[PDB]
C-alpha cells in the first residue's frame, strides 16, 4: 500500500522522535508545553539579537532582541490558544493533549516556557 523507506523506518529515528516531548504520550500537557516553549524561546532569541535594526548599537541589541523574541512567543501562544479553541469542540490510548483542556494547558505551558527561555537566553549572553 504505502511506500516504506529506511528514512521513515529506521529504529534510530523512531527512537529519536519518541524521545521528543510531543511524542511522550503520558506526561502532563503543561509540562510538554513548558519544555517545548523553553527549547523554542532559547533559539528564537538569536535572530532578533544578531540581525534586528538595533544590532549595531551596544548595550541595547540584546535588550531589543529579547523583547522581540518575547513578543513573538506571546503571538505564538495566542496562536496555540486559538488553534485549540477551533480544533477541539466536540467528541494505544487517547492522548490528553488533543483536547480542549489539554491544548489550553499546553498553550499556557508554552507561553511560560517561551518567556522563561527568552529570559534565560538574554542572561546567557551577559
Amino acid at each position: 500500500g504505502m511506500l516504506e523507506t529506511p528514512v521513515t523506518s529506521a529504529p534510530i529515528v523512531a527512537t529519536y522522535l519518541s524521545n521528543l516531548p510531543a511524542y511522550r504520550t503520558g506526561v502532563a500537557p503543561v509540562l510538554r508545553g513548558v519544555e517545548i516553549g523553553l527549547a523554542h524561546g532559547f533559539l528564537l532569541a538569536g535572530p532578533f539579537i544578531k540581525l534586528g535594526p538595533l544590532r549595531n548599537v551596544p548595550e541595547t541589541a540584546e535588550i531589543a532582541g529579547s523583547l522581540s523574541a518575547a513578543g513573538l512567543v506571546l503571538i505564538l501562544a495566542l496562536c496555540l490558544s486559538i488553534y485549540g479553541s477551533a480544533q477541539f469542540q466536540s467528541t494505544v490510548a487517547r492522548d490528553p493533549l488533543f483536547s480542549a483542556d489539554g491544548w489550553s494547558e499546553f498553550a499556557a505551558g508554552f507561553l511560560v516556557g517561551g518567556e522563561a527561555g527568552v529570559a534565560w537566553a538574554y542572561v546567557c549572553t551577559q
Binding site: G1, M2, L3
Partner: protein, 144 residues
C-alpha cells in the same frame, strides 16, 4: 441475485507500495474497497500510479475515492474482460455495496430499476427563474 458481502481476508495484488495511496480520510471519514476475480496472474496499472500484478483468483484493493474504484473497474472490464465490484467502508466497520448496485451494469437496462430525477418535459419548456425566485434557497427552474 443477492447483494454480496465484503471479505476482509481477501488477497491483494502484488504491489510494492506508493505515495498515492490512502490518507487520513480513510481512517476518519471513509474509504473504498474493490474486489474482482482474475483468470490468471497479470500486470495492470494502478489508478494511483504504478504497475501491480493481479493474482489468480480473488483480488482486493483499497482506494480513497469512488472514482479510483470505477477507473480500475473500467480498466479491468475493457482490457482483461473481468467483472469487478466495489464497496464503501466506514471506520466503524459498516460496508455498503456500490457498483453494480442491482447486480447488472448500469449501461444495460435491467428490470426493477425505478427512474429518478427524470423530467417529463424538454429543456425549452423550463420556466423562467423569476417564477422560482424567493424560494427556500438558490433553486434552478429545472429542480421543479
Amino acid at each position: 441475485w443477492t447483494v454480496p458481502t465484503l471479505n476482509p481476508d481477501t488477497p491483494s495484488p502484488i504491489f510494492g507500495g506508493s505515495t498515492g495511496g490512502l490518507l487520513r480520510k480513510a481512517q476518519t471519514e471513509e474509504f473504498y474497497v474493490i474486489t474482482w476475480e482474475a483468470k490468471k496472474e497479470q500486470i495492470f496499472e494502478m489508478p494511483t500510479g504504478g504497475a501491480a500484478i493481479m493474482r489468480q483468483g480473488p483480488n482486493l484493493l483499497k482506494f480513497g475515492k469512488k472514482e479510483q474504484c470505477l477507473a480500475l473497474t473500467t480498466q479491468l472490464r475493457n482490457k482483461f474482460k473481468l467483472t469487478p465490484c466495489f464497496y464503501r467502508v466506514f471506520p466503524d466497520g459498516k460496508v455498503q455495496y456500490l457498483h453494480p448496485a442491482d447486480g447488472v451494469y448500469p449501461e444495460k437496462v435491467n428490470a426493477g430499476r425505478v427512474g429518478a430525477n427524470q423530467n417529463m418535459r424538454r429543456i425549452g419548456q423550463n420556466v423562467n427563474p423569476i417564477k422560482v425566485k424567493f424560494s427556500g434557497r438558490m433553486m434552478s427552474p429545472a429542480e421543479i
